[PDB]
Chain A
């Protein structure tokens, strides 16, 4: 376990995981708030 979590902290896996999380977040934001051209508040 400790070594498995160390493996999950490696740059190859953590980078890929973070890119996946940020990509998913942008995809969700664009799915619910689409076609937003300006910061209309």
Chain B
């Protein structure tokens, strides 16, 4: 409980939702020989649904007045309640992968800018160079913080063109 939200493993509405959705799939089953391809597909679907509902209850997600899992988007109020996997950990994971792709693209631009025909190396990518830079982009937190502490990441506005006010 973090804000009037009982753990889904306790909420009765969550188990009721599990029950109802499984009962619907059972009603769909009761029409085929339990060895035909449709019957096997339905049985696999029911197994998948049961696995999902047990997995959600195991991880202690919070269910509301209705039986639906809720997430917490405040560090500290999710780290002292064991719910950091809801937003904070995926926040780190995204920020990392997004930065990886962005840094790989940025370094590819800065690498093909200093060539003979920079406008040509954007529509006909150099795949070995792109792949090398894609591999080097994994350390992007380190390299980006190095360039910020170095001052080489950014450009002074006296050199960027601007509009006539």
Q: Which residues of A come within 8 Å of B, CB atoms?
A: 6, 8-11, 14, 34-35, 37-41
- B93 interfacial by beta-carbon distance below 8 Å: yes
Q: What residues of chain A lie closer than 8 Å to B124, measured between beta carbons?
A: 6, 9-11
Q: Which residues of B come within 8 Å of A, CB atoms?
A: 48, 51-52, 55-56, 59, 61, 69, 71, 85-86, 89-90, 93, 122-127
Q: How far is the CA of A6 from the CA of B86 in the complex (A)?
A: 44
Contact status of A41 and B125, CB under 8 A, knowing A34-B48, A35-B48, A35-B55: no
Give the A-B contact count at a CB cut-off of 8 A: 39
Q: How far is the CA of A40 from the CA of B127 in the complex (A)?
A: 36
Q: How far is the CA of A41 from the CA of B59 in the complex (A)?
A: 10
When the two chains form the complex, which single residue of A11, A35, A40 contacts B52, counting CB atoms closer than 8 Å?
A35
Q: What residues of chain A lie closer than 8 Å to B127, measured between beta carbons?
A: 8-9, 14
Identify the interface centre among A9, A11, A35, A39: most chain B CB within 10 Å of its CB. Answer: A39
Q: What residues of chain B lie closer than 8 Å to A11, measured between beta carbons?
A: 122-125
Q: How far is the CA of A38 from the CA of B55 in the complex (A)?
A: 11
Q: How far is the CA of A38 from the CA of B59 in the complex (A)?
A: 9
